[PDB]
RNA sequence: UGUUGCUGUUAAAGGGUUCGUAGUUGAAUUGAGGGCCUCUAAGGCGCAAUGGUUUAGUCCCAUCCACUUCGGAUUGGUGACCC
RNA sequence: AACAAAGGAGCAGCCUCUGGGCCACCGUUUCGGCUUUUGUUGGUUUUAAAAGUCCAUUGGAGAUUAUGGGGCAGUGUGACAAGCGGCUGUCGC
RNA sequence: CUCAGCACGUUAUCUGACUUCUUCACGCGAAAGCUUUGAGGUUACAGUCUC
């Protein structure tokens, strides 16, 4: 049966963060490669502006609102939230 | 409710649920606090401060990684700037407001905008001259 | 169980029965309070005869909660399979 | 004198405890000719006491007692510490607790604002757990409330680290109720942010 | 914004009843709506509640048996007293028998019948049927 | 005249709107502790033991083979679970 | 619940055994005040504790690592492109 | 390529606005009507302020 206390996996897929439960966070990061070397950089997925490395003019974020469009070529590995 | 005229958003951020420092950072408070004084040189406020650690270093919150947060930081090493960082921004919109109506005194709107944001700074400066980090015989003008 | 006296004597006309599902007192007066009365069966297909008993408040005909409470109160006691 | 008590504070050097002394050496052992980063850093280190629990399941627990001054260092080694320390000493968990100190209400409000924040009951405790849990870390609690009033901790881990601390689990209530008189349940979590239980 | 905390709780609570509901969320959480919660729950009114942490403010969860009729809070939380506890119990409730009023005094958070017992009257809180 | 205990969509009655001082009202945290003995005091989603041929069960198995909606078979089976 | 304060580097006592050295104490205006005992009152002066201050190490803490952080120097490790090399954009010295 | 790692549409979810059920649930109201968008949660009469 059904619990507020305890909710289904399948409801809380659904909802924004400030209606959660918890009311945790709905970001994580993300290990870009720059492709002009290599050099693995942390980079931040609502990352809401540029982010440089001196392996790259090739950028490795583009600065956009809904979250953040990648360069083209570049390794990506997802860290985890926690 | 949006303090002066219309307004419902929940447009906001949240908070980790880990406030402990991430497995992926193995930097110490001290590098921490070295790039938020090197960077507060440039004359960068601390909300840039935030972003441009976040995004570049993977830091979940300056406060996770270090014993305080980024004020505190630049108050102890004699950095801090003693105008606060909202009260600084109104007043730079205000005279932008009062340059273009300068030229346009048919501008509706703008105007009525500067009577809010003109109360507001008010506001603003009551508050810290009760909770002292002004003078205490400031004034907007 | 109902009003007494110092007496312990009850001075009630009935003592009202039971909805299950919001337990809540039956009126009288609510004529919409159905008291399905459901036989119970055993190995071999063969009926027990009638045993349990559910009683519907006329509160949740109005909206037609009936079938979702039914449904809790059954599964409870094992009438109602789920996987 | 020994050069293995330096790992104890100075007054209980000339009156060590049988536990005190087993520990001592063990320290001392492995601050020479070891895996590095705990062949120098113990020596800065120093123990208040320790002692030796035993509940009435399978093992004991040693328990370890050193200021809160040294927590800052310890809690980066922590793992490494307690882990190569059961080795020299079997068949008994270690475990580290910093030792902290507690506050009252005193019954006034202009002095109950002036006290620490950090001092008082609540947040030693929490700390005192998340210690003792490590590694590991703490999602989210919640109170559960009977009809005695009766209320009951529970905390809430991460299935990621699930293995580690699942054995580990009646030995660590046992030492935090026994200490500062609060029951204390672990659950775990598959996706802890959306707090669903499972077994999982 | 709110001005009382019971108020956002026990307007949650009362209309939940009034649609026959087994479980209602809270919004806040404080000290005192615990205690409040806590004495129904040992006189039959409640099976069980929960409080859940966010690590900001509390939620609380309760569970219904539908053996309310009504929670309310009274906001000024005004002045009774010894004698002015049969006034309170006889104005805002159906009945002497099982009018249950909730008043504050230093000693804690009690029902007026063991308000009386100890004699020392107070500001009143909250009741329920 | 409605503090206890009033009304204001249409019946007497929400100010054309916004800013704003006196005044009125204002969120959460500090935390109200424990053990050993007796008591059939209760619950138990803990549990060693040992009980129970269907004097109670379901999965497996046996025999059929029934194209597909029969079954029974005994010690079945530290199995499952029930007093 | 209200009053008031704080507004967070706009701050902040480590305790302690013993020994030595110096040192009036209030006070600073042309001479004022001053603790007992020595029988007592009147006068000066000394020794001595006290307090302060300087050094000394005796034992113990610390709520945040001083065998530490910060900044210089020597050697080897890994490494880019021109100068050099493989024998097929890229690899190394 | 060229205001273009683009724009539109469909499925599903969410936050913020305006309103319809001419099958709006409970409830309220003298009735007309009102319904997460209250005139609802009010004689079981008390969230806050004001006209």
């Known amino acids: 049966d059904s619990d507020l206390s305890y909710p289904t996996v399948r409801s809380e897929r659904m909802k924004h963060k400030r209606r959660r439960l918890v009311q945790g966070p709905n970001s994580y990061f993300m290990d870009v490669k720059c492709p002009g070397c290599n050099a693995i950089t942390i980079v931040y997925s609502h990352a809401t502006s540029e982010v440089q490395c001196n392996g790259c003019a090739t950028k490795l974020c583009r600065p956009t609102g809904g979250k953040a469009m990648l360069t083209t070529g570049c390794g990506f590995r997802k860290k985890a939230d926690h | ?56 270093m993977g830091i979940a919150q300056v406060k996770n990684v270090t014993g305080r947060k980024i004020l505190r930081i630049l108050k102890h090493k004699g950095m801090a700037p003693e105008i606060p960082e909202d009260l600084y921004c109104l007043i730079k919109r205000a005279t932008e407001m009062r340059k273009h109506l300068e030229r346009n005194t048919k501008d509706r709107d703008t105007k009525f ?10 506001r603003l400066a009551r508050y810290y001259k009760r909770v002292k980090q002004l003078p205490p015989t400031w004034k907007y003008e | 169980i109902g009003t007494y006296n110092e007496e312990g004597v009850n001075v009630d006309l009935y003592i009202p029965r039971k909805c299950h599902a919001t337990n809540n007192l039956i009126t009288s007066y609510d004529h919409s309070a159905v008291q399905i009365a459901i036989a119970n069966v055993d190995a071999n297909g063969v009926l027990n005869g009638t045993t349990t008993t559910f009683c519907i ?12 409470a039914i449904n809790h109160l059954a599964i409870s006691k094992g009438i109602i399979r789920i996987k | 004198v020994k050069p293995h008590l330096r790992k104890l504070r100075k007054l209980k050097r000339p009156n060590p405890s049988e536990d005190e002394d087993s520990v001592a050496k063990a320290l001392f052992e492995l601050e020479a000719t070891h895996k590095t980063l705990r062949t120098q850093l113990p020596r800065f280190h120093i123990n208040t006491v320790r002692t030796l ?10 328990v370890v007692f050193y200021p809160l001054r040294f927590l800052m260092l310890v809690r980066k080694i922590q793992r490494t510490l307690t882990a190569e320390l059961e080795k020299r000493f079997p068949g008994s968990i270690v475990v580290l607790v910093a030792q902290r100190k507690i506050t009252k209400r005193p019954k006034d409000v202009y002095k109950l604002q002036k006290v620490q924040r950090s001092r008082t009951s609540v947040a030693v405790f929490e700390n005192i757990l998340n210690d003792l849990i490590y590694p590991c870390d703490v999602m989210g609690r919640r109170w559960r409330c009977r009809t005695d009033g009766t209320k009951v901790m529970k905390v809430f881990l991460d299935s990621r680290d699930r293995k580690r601390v699942e054995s580990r689990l009646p030995i660590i209530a ?27 | 914004t709110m ?23 809270i919004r806040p959480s404080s000290k005192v709506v615990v205690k409040f919660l806590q004495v129904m729950q040992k006189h039959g009114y409640i099976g069980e509640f929960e409080i859940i942490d966010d690590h900001r403010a509390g939620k609380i969860v309760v569970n219904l048996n539908g053996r309310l009729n009504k929670c309310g809070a009274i906001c000024p939380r005004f002045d009774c007293t010894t004698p002015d506890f049969e006034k309170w119990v006889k ?20 029902d007026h019948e063991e308000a009386r017992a100890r004699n020392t009257g107070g500001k009143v809180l909250g009741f329920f049927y």
């Open chain 2, 113 to 122: 905008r500067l009577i809010l944001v003109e109360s507001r700074i008010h």
């Open chain 4, 174 to 200: 046992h030492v935090y109720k026994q200490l500062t008189h609060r029951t204390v349940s672990f659950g775990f979590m598959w996706n802890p942010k959306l707090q669903q239980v499972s077994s999982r």
């Open chain 2, 1 to 56: 409710v949006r303090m002066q005229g219309v307004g419902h958003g929940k447009s906001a951020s949240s908070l980790p649920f880990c406030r402990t420092p991430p497995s992926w950072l193995k930097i110490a408070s001290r590098d921490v606090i070295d790039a938020v004084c090197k960077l507060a040189k440039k004359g960068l406020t601390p909300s840039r401060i935030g972003m441009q650690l976040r995004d570049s």
């Open chain 5, 91 to 110: 104005n805002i409730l159906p009945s002497r028998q099982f009018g249950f009023v909730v008043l504050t005094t230093s000693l804690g958070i009690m």
């Open chain 3, 57 to 68: 408040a006329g509160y949740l005909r109005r909206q037609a909660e009936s079938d979702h």
């Open chain 5, 3 to 25: 001005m009382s905390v019971l108020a956002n709780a026990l307007r949650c609570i009362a209309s939940a009843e009034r649609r026959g509901k087994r479980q209602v969320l």
């Open chain 4, 53 to 62: 629990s035993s509940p009435r399941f399978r093992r004991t627990a040693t």
